[PDB]
């Protein structure tokens, strides 16, 4: 991700077939002539999409131009959470399924994985960050405390941001309960709250390298959303 001061991010297309698949997804969703009620509703939960971009002197170098969801925040606290029971797609080989399950073999039980967080601490005027190893180290026993950390500013638990997150996830969950034309593997929710405030939160869907047409509910995604909501709910009892 490259932040731009014009309030957008440029995401470089990943290698084939992932990058091309993601470009195609955004193009389908944000088709100018799209009248599909499901896809029109979905746009509410994605970053705004400004089309494909490439440097003036480099047509080969493909990016997606996306809304920077963190632009309107003073001290944005950011967490990326992968959603679902399977991070591998319907066209994965045995080798690839094994790779994907191994990266975080706990995916099926929990239904989500924290990919990283960046949390502003008020009393130090500074950021702590966690990388992919943090979330991959979380278990059933420690997932609640693991997620809680995102909402801890170093004096209070931000239950306002927790409750707001639940309410925004609930809307995404309602979208998933009302569609059976897309299944999402290895896709994420991006959480952003204001670290500096009260209950002002972004929750957006990102990372669409493994979205496929379907004829079923995305039961894996739903399981993950619900577990994540359940965890956030229990954090409110702290």
Element (H, E) at 97: helix 94-103
CB proximity list for 201: less than 8 A, separation 6 or greater: 161, 164, 165, 168, 191, 192, 193
Expressed in angstroms, the distance from the first to the final Cα of the chain is 34
13 binds ligand YHH (CB under 6 A): no
Closest CA to 182 of 202, 210, 206: 210
Tokens of 159: 């239950």
Which residues participate in the annotated binding site? 11, 18, 67-69, 80, 82, 96-103, 132, 207, 210
CB of 108 to ligand YHH, least distance (A): 23
- Per the DSSP assignment, residues forming a β-bridge with 76 are 194
Single residue of 80, 89, 130, 194 touching ligand YHH by CB under 6 A: 80
Single residue of 14, 27, 54, 70 touching ligand YHH by CB under 6 A: 70
Closer of 3 and 230 to ligand YHH (Cβ): 3
CB of 67 to ligand YHH, least distance (A): 6
CB of 234 to ligand YHH, least distance (A): 25
Single residue of 3, 12, 126, 178 touching ligand YHH by CB under 6 A: 3
Looking only at residues 27 through 56 of this chain, which bind ligand YHH when binding is defined by CB under 6 A?
47
1 binds ligand YHH (CB under 6 A): yes
The conformational region for residue 46 under phi > 0 = left, psi -120 to 50 = alpha, else beta, is beta
113 binds ligand YHH (CB under 6 A): no
Single residue of 89, 130, 194, 207 touching ligand YHH by CB under 6 A: 207
Identify whether the C-beta of residue 209 lies closer than 8 Å to the C-beta of residue 14.
Answer: yes
How many residues sit close enough to ligand YHH to count as binding (CB under 6 A)? 14
Distance CA 83, CA 91 (A): 18
CB proximity list for 136: less than 8 A, separation 6 or greater: 103, 104, 113
User: Binding residues for ligand YHH, per CB under 6 A?
Assistant: 1, 3, 9, 11, 47, 66, 68-70, 78, 80, 190, 206-207
């Amino acid at each position: 991700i490259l932040q731009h001061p014009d309030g957008t991010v440029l995401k470089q297309l990943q290698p084939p077939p992932r990058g091309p698949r993601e470009l195609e997804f955004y193009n389908m969703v944000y088709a100018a002539d799209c009248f599909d009620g499901v896809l029109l509703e979905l746009r509410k939960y994605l970053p705004k999409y400004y089309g494909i971009w490439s440097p003036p002197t480099a047509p080969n170098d493909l990016y997606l131009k996306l809304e920077d969801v963190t632009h309107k925040f003073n001290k944005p606290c950011i967490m990326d959470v992968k959603i679902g029971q399977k991070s591998y797609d319907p066209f994965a080989s045995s080798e690839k399924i094994q790779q994907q399950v191994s990266k975080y073999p706990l995916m099926e039980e929990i239904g989500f994985l924290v990919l990283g967080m960046r949390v502003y601490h008020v009393h130090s005027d500074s950021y702590e960050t966690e990388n992919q190893h943090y979330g991959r180290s979380l278990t059933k026993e420690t997932i609640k405390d693991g997620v809680s950390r995102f909402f801890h500013n170093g004096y209070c638990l931000r239950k306002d941001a927790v409750a707001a997150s639940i309410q925004k996830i609930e809307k995404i969950l309602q979208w998933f309960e009302n569609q059976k034309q897309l299944n999402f593997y290895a896709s994420s929710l991006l959480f952003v709250y204001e670290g500096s405030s009260g209950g002002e939160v972004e929750v957006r869907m990102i990372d669409f390298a493994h979205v496929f047409p379907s004829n079923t509910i995305d039961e894996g995604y739903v399981y993950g959303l619900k577990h994540l909501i359940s965890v956030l709910r229990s954090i409110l009892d702290n």
